[PDB]
Design a protein around this ligand. Structure first.
Ligand SMILES: C[C@H](O)CNC(=O)Nc1ccccc1
Ligand SMILES: C[C@H](O)CNC(=O)Nc1ccccc1
Ligand SMILES: [Zn+2]
Ligand SMILES: [Zn+2]
Ligand SMILES: [Zn+2]
Ligand SMILES: [Zn+2]
Lengths: 360, 360
């Protein structure tokens, strides 16, 4: 059976499970069941399933080199699909809540969930809560007797926590740290002293890399009972490296990818985000360029946004991007080599993960 | 050592643990640590700790009748405090997110967290996320080797899910179920056909009783290794019964308790909530009273709100309240009796839980 169709079939199975349990155990009525169904579909479906499919792909790699009964191969592939949907639903949770936090308008060429007429923020915050709660219901039901349940829940928990801490880093990235104070309305930085590579790397490491790369790889190892085919510190380092590159790519696209293709009007400049473009620009700008950046960044005025995009264009950040990209290529290839010592198979799964990211 | 001081000491210990781990493992800076510290204190402290203290009280009851080494008594009381703070932090999560959802202004005589000048909704949604994530970090660290970890996490998970489903019931209680549709803006009911006792009871059962009464009682049983001193179906029934009564009390107070004493300007009438007052009123009203209710409910206009409160006053709902209260007294006393068959001690813990609720 082809992987994607297995994975989509499992979505249907998990959805039916969840909705049927709401009826039998939580006293739900048909209409609220239908609302939840629609919420689940709208918020969890229509992306590329990179995250969830990675769990499946890692598991398929191990199956090719490991002796098992056919029934066991099916059980492992089913568990990899359920685990992948746990990650897709965790992403859905964070995208619903982030879109509300950031006053976002669109996502994947459709309105953000909270903007749907019959949703509203009042419902949507809680819908996002339910999305993450479903990840736990899936795990407790499908992995009840599994030897990896403990480790999978502990890992998922750490990754969710890292992700929330990364959200905090992100939403506070345009403030001066010494001024953070619940009692005082937060001004935007005027110095931009905290727009540095290390501070950027902290934001992206926590906001995105743990859930997008670390969790899919380690979940495919867990459902395969293969965590001893790796050096976990290597897996962490390669996840964090690829994941950073993914985010840099997303930062450049927010500024330069046409909206119809982005699925999004990008507003990182207006929102004063600590983007790779802004940190790279401040790393090579002269005094007058720095001052012109400071006069225009973090403002909704389209003319000021056009001045920042011009400053980026004239600073030939494409060349810095190519240089960054070449260094990451170098480093990812090195880690892949190190991962072949313990597991050619796992190494190859990471190579595929890299190819997929590198070729967006 | 007195229970409350043990419990507050453990708060300090858990806070320090959590903040120190952010520093050592999550790369946090001192200023963001201070923001989180302040968030934790503001959102988790200053209530009566009924929930968390119930875990401690159930555990203390068992200790009085069970042989243990002193070191074991201390370990059980510490675990009961940590478990109680897991529930207090789960409540904090839901109160932060609910206040945002409901556009609330105050709570416990202070502004809602999101309204603090240096918070904002953008931060506060995520702060609420972190509050619940902390409950998992506490459990994984403090209960790592404990025989009850599995059962405590499974239970907590179910209770959190029930609570989110109850939030859905609550926020959608003034809509007609057959009209729920993400694509269509939701009108308020005009018939009030779904303002019934059974529909009310479903809202309150899920929104409040699982986290407020079921979880503190069952957590005190789990940390005591005492789940075989009870019939779980009795514990469920008594939790749901007392918890309903608690909420009816909160509904009457939203309408009739002066704001300075409530900690809150109550807005259930304007918000068109399915309250005990509204369902009781519609259960005894004549045709003209029903029509006058329909013209005035669910409207911000203070004159219309004054007309609903008058309709409630003239309908002598105090008498229905007394009758309800007498029935619950009857039923709670009956369940307490049944619980004495297996455990006088646990029975007495539930009696205390009832006394505390009955005497608010
Ligand atoms: C518009 C979105 O970016 C589309 N989704 C992706 O590009 N997802 C993705 C693809 C490859 C690697 C990692 C993640
Ligand atoms: C203003 C709030 O209602 C104060 N808190 C409580 O009354 N909490 C409480 C007390 C007894 C039983 C159950 C819960
Ligand atoms: Zn965001
Ligand atoms: Zn972006
Ligand atoms: Zn609410
Ligand atoms: Zn209320």
């Amino acid at each position: 059976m082809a992987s994607m169709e297995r994975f989509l079939s499992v979505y249907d199975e998990v959805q039916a499970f969840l909705l049927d349990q709401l009826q039998s155990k939580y006293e739900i009525d048909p209409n609220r069941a239908r609302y939840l169904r629609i919420m689940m579909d709208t918020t969890c479906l229509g992306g590329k399933y990179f995250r969830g499919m990675t769990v499946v792909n890692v598991a398929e790699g191990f199956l090719a080199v490991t002796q098992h009964d056919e029934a066991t191969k099916e059980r492992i592939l089913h568990d990899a699909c359920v685990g992948g949907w746990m990650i897709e639903f965790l992403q859905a949770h964070y995208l619903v809540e982030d879109d509300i936090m950031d006053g976002s308008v669109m996502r994947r060429g459709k309105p953000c969930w909270y903007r749907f007429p019959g949703v509203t923020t009042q419902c949507a915050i809680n819908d996002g809560i339910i999305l993450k709660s479903w990840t736990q219901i899936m795990a407790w039901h499908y992995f009840a007797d599994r030897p990896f349940l403990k480790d999978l829940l502990c890992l998922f928990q750490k990754v969710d926590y890292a992700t929330a801490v990364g959200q905090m880093y992100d939403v506070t990235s345009m403030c001066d740290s010494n001024k953070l104070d619940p009692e005082v309305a937060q001004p935007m930085t005027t110095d931009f002293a905290e727009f540095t590579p290390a501070i950027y790397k902290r934001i992206v490491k926590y906001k995105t890399t743990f859930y997008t790369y670390l969790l899919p790889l380690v979940m495919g190892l867990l459902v395969s009972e293969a965590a001893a085919s790796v050096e976990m510190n290597l897996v962490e380092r390669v996840a964090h490296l690829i994941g950073e590159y993914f985010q840099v790519q997303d930062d450049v696209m927010d500024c330069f990818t046409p909206p119809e293709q982005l699925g999004k009007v990008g507003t990182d400049i207006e929102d004063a985000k600590c983007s790779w473009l802004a940190v790279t620009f401040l790393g090579k700008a002269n005094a007058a360029q720095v001052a012109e950046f400071k006069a225009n960044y973090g403002e909704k005025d389209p003319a000021k946004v056009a001045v920042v995009k011009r400053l980026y264009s004239k600073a030939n950040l494409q060349a810095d991007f190519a240089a960054y990209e070449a260094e990451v290529v170098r480093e990812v290839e090195s880690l892949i080599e190190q991962l072949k010592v313990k597991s050619p198979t796992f190494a190859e799964s990471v190579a595929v993960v890299w190819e997929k990211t590198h070729k967006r």
